[PDB]
Design a protein around this ligand. Structure first.
Ligand code: ADP
Ligand code: ADP
Ligand code: ADP
Ligand code: MG
Ligand code: MG
Ligand code: MG
Lengths: 524, 524, 524
């Protein structure tokens, strides 16, 4: 409707207060002793979470100027989650520290643009320092420790995650689903498998649940559905002559083909079962080539140079056996050459490094894992539905944290790494005095994540910080055991990527935020 | 609806206040030390920008009379942006200065219409003076300096821009896109390239990512899509006889043609890949003639005296090789005569000098750059999305500023050129005394852009101006280094076109603005 | 629904105040020193104008009784604009003067109807006096002076207008459009030209921009579109036999005819280009005969006794050459007899004196100018859109003023003519005393336009008027030079038609308005 305009200090104060509301809610969930935050949903049962990004999204303020401040700080928490999926609560804390000190500096009469220059320069230097401190994470023990720390110090989570990564490999795919029982369960899938059931329920080779096992079967792939387009008899009889079972993958199969097929399988003429292709025209067609090559078969290009009849038994691929159920199809092992398997994988490398990243790489990797690696699913056990999402959420954070730790390495936890690097940068200077103050402000803000953890434990945050600063290297305070020692030796690890990202995202938004002279928003 | 009307001073005061609100928000973003303004969007996250035109657009006032004043001053900032895309904040300042002094003169009991004439006459003389001061900008260093100054004194921006203009040439096309990394990147395209990928993924000549390389290929252009429109075999056969690869450009190619084509390419009969034309029929058809002429080929006029089959292999154009991927088609070098290349370019000159200007010239120039010059794309690197728009926006201003500086020349920055010209015009007189005062008022307003920069630096605006006036030529104060010297030697440059345009747009609206006796608006 | 009613003095007072509000806004824009009025639009940006009629339209009052008075006075300004397009502000002033004095007489206890008769009788006598004072405006200098005076003393406007009328002639057509630059530009069209481009882009005779020049072409006119309607070969070949270019005018031409036509032209068999007729069926059909007769050709009546094939080469019209572009078609000179040209013009005289007048005459004259005279278009230069409408609006008023001055002559400006005629009518008497007072009141009101001009100049209106009355003939006060002299010799002219119309429209509504005894309106 009609706008409201605020200038200078009045606008900054409202912005800050809004930021404080967002940050105060987020801070309580930081650390081993962190406390849960409950979000109200009209959708159904209210949510209880310790995840800072989840809390940031739900916070909106009635005061438009305060709300604007909160909305801008919201992004840093959201970006951290996007970059690594962990460290979001810590990133918000840094934004709080930087903003509060920065605004205070602005009040002092210092130029905001220069203060931003100081902060950014300090950030660039701090990032390089983090890289030097970062050490490779490769062994199972280190991987388990990062998972355990991410999941609010839950040993079972780290243990299970480490086993998963070990078993599936570097390019394996790991996901998490709600478990049927209280106990946490790990499921590992071997071979080539997809989520498609069988069109003909009637043909079950032996096990119940609709499990079809074909021994030494031939595999058929096609680009069209079959109704009265039954004609394929010379292909079918060729298989009948062989006396071997047939597996069919295509857009669809209709009852006319299925009806004759069922009698043929029961009578003993041929043992044949069929299943639908993966899903969408481009989606299913793309995944057909790998199935055929893996089994040594040839895909029938209805669209291109091939016809339904036009195909020889030799075209069909070979596999040891397959498993089929109402919702899933599995192939134990297609027989094909490694050079062909690797060649399929080699062409995937361009696919792997793609501009799109999100929703590109994720599906793409899954094909890759199926082609030569393995797929792992983790089940989460909880007595109640609300307990279940909290438990599962933390597990995902640990899952993402391990992925980040492996690729970029790890640094000491408890916020020790940021405070330790700050001492190193104590001699860093900018173009002018305002920049020097901005640099100093950023270093000052680095300390805050460490002290929030201590604050949440009900202990003097400044006191612990002074003792930690006094020490050297990886020395720090363990909130869980309320004592000082080597953070790395205690199993407390922070992946380098999340630590780096938290600092950079917090600083980027904070630098711009502190420079705001005037704000424009709608009237109440 | 019911109307509210104000007469004389009451209407002017309300108008002035509206103007002041709009201008005050705009002023803080002027200079090396300028401060950012944050605009609230319901659309998504809030926007932070130093661009005055962006800020002017978003300002609306609750008071209808004040709002009307702001809306009228909004146009000067917007028109300046349309003219050259830079100096919008500076133009707003001049409007502020002129209006405030002009209204004061009106209060004094002076006829407003005469004051407007005085201002306009002074402006006309000032413009001529600017032209005399303006010197040609031809070297890379000068171009870089204007880009660097435009982009809030960022040396890298000016450097990257200058390299681009040098590489592409005078008629080359330069654009800016968001970069994947944190580093600014420059991309240069050589030869003829377009944004359409290949219909047949199946034929890849060698490199991965769908890259197709045809060696000494023949190029075919058509005005019709092909389904069962397979016929053209004798043209195809002729190419097969030749033993050379074929490139196809048309509205579309269907699977039937693609199907036979894929097998033919695989068996080695012919190596042929097809790519879709540019897009819109008036669009792609227009761009077809140049492709053909460049490669020495003939476009097939399905519409006119030509037929699908009717065409000899000789009709087809030739090129060294082409590069094709999923979303892009490139031709290394078609072999055609310069007279044909230039002739296509010569006919473009009418196209260049077009009344529409906006949109018509932009697409048109892009064809031109591809035909004989080069095309450059600049990527912008930033830690966050909000940082990215700010960073990218400034780069565009510098890009536009360089374009303006090359064509109309440059003048000394820091507002020195307007203040320096004002001293020259101190002896300018109008028809009567009221006009003389109007002239004097305009000269007085010229000083303001200089002093706003100083004001934003926390220094006495009048003090710096007095010393600057005392000097001669290009002598002035450098806000960034807080010292006095030759503005041109330092590297602070203002394109003549933006300087001229800012002054003229500000004055045009302001003269009308100060002559308002009565205002009419809807009730609150 | 329910209404509020008022009687006598209470109703008249409310009416008067409404009138005063409307008139006060209008008065400030009267004279060389007149001040601008700004109107708020929800359409887009606000409008700034000195045109009284524009201001009157936008004024509406919250008080229903006051609003009713304003609505009635609005019409006089609007009717004056319709009659001549100028003097609307002056007419409103007369209504103000007459109404205020008339109401005062009603207050005195005199019959209003008699006052009306007195006013009307004085008006009738005043009109006759104006006719006697009116002298013919025939020279370029007098025309320029009226244009310049109308355009708020802008010499360039009068100069450009006079040149336009001189060049085009008495029956020529002059229009005004927004210019492409900051300078006023005049465009004159010689010969026969229309706003239709070519259907076949392919045939361009020589100059770039789609320009087609046919040398000694034959012109063909038709009543239907051509698709498969290609047949007309013997007509076409007859031209081919001749070896001359062909110009085609019809409802439409389709690609079948155009495709063959392009190839025939390309090899030099025939040089033929085709364009579309003027517009709507009746519109294009009406203007076809003149084109044919002008070029000596015959129109093909598909509708009547003629057929597509049925037409000889001799039936085709002949012209020296034609010019064609994408949006326009021009013929240098068709060869036809003057008696036929004049005969076409002679039949137009019935068309010229038409009851419809508005729209009918405007389009009709344009045909007339094209047939034997010329067409002129004036472009208006400005830096901003708002500046552009004000500048253009005044130019149109001057254009209308010159048109009015030529046909009915001119009288001395500055309001001298009305005040001078009033002295003459000082001895005029009615049937009774109340009528005598009404007459005297009207004469009294005549003085007001003169004094508003002086009032707007900040000088004693009564003092100037007393000296003006004291003088003889064309003696008067020049507001622009602040001195007394002969108004005609100083170049200040008022077209007789606007002066007469202003007085008559003002008085007609005012006479009825002063006689109102009771008003009825809706409740607040
Ligand atoms: N038991 C612990 N002792 C010391 N530090 C811990 C302990 N548990 C977690 N931390 C640290 O505190 C940080 C915040 O924990 P977390 O809730 O996971 O926040 P994120 O959600 O990671 O901001 C960790 O990244 C880690 O370095
Ligand atoms: N460091 C500087 N010292 C002196 N003058 C400067 C400096 N930097 C920029 N300027 C000048 O002040 C003007 C305003 O800067 P800018 O923010 O780009 O505003 P526009 O957006 O150009 O109004 C410039 O066009 C230039 O002439
Ligand atoms: N410079 C001048 N000196 C004296 N009288 C003038 C001058 N300019 C215009 N006038 C007169 O005052 C009248 C009003 O001017 P104008 O603004 O054009 O009103 P209209 O809009 O014509 O009522 C004119 O018609 C003319 O007679
Ligand atoms: Mg965590
Ligand atoms: Mg700029
Ligand atoms: Mg006028």
């Amino acid at each position: 409707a009609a706008k409201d305009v605020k200038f200078g200090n009045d606008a900054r104060v409202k912005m800050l207060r809004g930021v404080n509301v967002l940050a105060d809610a987020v801070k309580v969930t930081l650390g081993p002793k962190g406390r849960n935050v409950v979000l109200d949903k009209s959708f159904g049962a209210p949510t209880i979470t310790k995840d800072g990004v989840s809390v940031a999204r739900e916070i909106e303020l009635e005061d438009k100027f305060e709300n604007m401040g909160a909305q801008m700080v919201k992004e840093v928490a959201s970006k951290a989650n996007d970059a690594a999926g962990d460290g979001t609560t810590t990133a918000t804390v840094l934004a709080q520290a930087i903003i509060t000190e920065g605004l205070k500096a602005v009040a002092a009469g210092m130029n905001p643009m220069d203060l931003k220059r100081g902060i950014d320069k300090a950030v660039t230097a701090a990032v390089e320092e983090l890289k030097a401190l970062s050490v490779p994470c490769s062994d199972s023990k280190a991987i388990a420790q990062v998972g355990t720390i991410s999941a609010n110090s839950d040993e079972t989570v780290g243990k299970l995650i480490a086993e998963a990564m070990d078993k599936v490999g570097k390019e394996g795919v790991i996901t998490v689903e709600d478990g049927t029982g209280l106990q946490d369960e790990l499921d590992v899938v071997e071979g080539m498998q997809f989520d498609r059931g069988y069109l003909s329920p009637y043909f079950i080779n032996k096990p119940e649940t609709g499990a079809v096992e074909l021994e030494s079967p031939f595999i058929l792939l096609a680009d069209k559905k079959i109704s009265n387009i039954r004609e394929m008899l010379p292909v079918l009889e060729a298989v009948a002559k062989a006396g071997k079972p047939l597996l069919i993958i295509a857009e669809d199969v209709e009852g006319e083909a299925l009806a004759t097929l069922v009698v043929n399988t029961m009578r003993g003429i041929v043992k044949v079962a069929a299943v639908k292709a993966p899903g969408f025209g481009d989606r299913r067609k793309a995944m057909l080539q790998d199935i055929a090559t893996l089994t040594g078969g040839t895909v029938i290009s209805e669209e291109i140079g091939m016809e339904l009849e036009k195909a020889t038994l030799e075209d069909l691929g070979q596999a040891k056996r397959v498993v089929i159920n109402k919702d899933t199809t599995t192939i134990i092992d297609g027989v094909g050459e490694e050079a062909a398997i690797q060649g399929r994988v080699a062409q995937i490398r361009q696919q792997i490094e793609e501009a799109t990243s999100d929703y590109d790489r994720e599906k793409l990797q899954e094909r890759v894992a199926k082609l030569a690696g393995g797929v792992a699913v983790i089940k989460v056990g909880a007595a109640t539905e609300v307990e279940m999402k909290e438990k599962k959420a933390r597990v995902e954070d640990a899952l993402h944290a391990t992925r980040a730790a492996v690729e970029e390495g790890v640094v000491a936890g408890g916020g020790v790494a940021l405070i330790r690097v700050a001492s190193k940068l104590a001699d860093l200077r900018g173009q002018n005095e305002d920049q020097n103050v901005g640099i100093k402000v950023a270093l000052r803000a680095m300390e805050a994540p460490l002290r929030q953890i201590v604050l949440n434990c009900g202990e003097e945050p400044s006191v612990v910080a002074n003792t930690v600063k006094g020490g050297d290297g990886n020395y720090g305070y363990n909130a869980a055991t309320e004592e000082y020692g080597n953070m790395i030796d205690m199993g407390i690890l922070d992946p380098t990527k999340v630590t780096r990202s938290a600092l950079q995202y917090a600083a980027s938004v904070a630098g711009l935020m502190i420079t705001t002279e005037c704000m424009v928003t709608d009237l109440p």
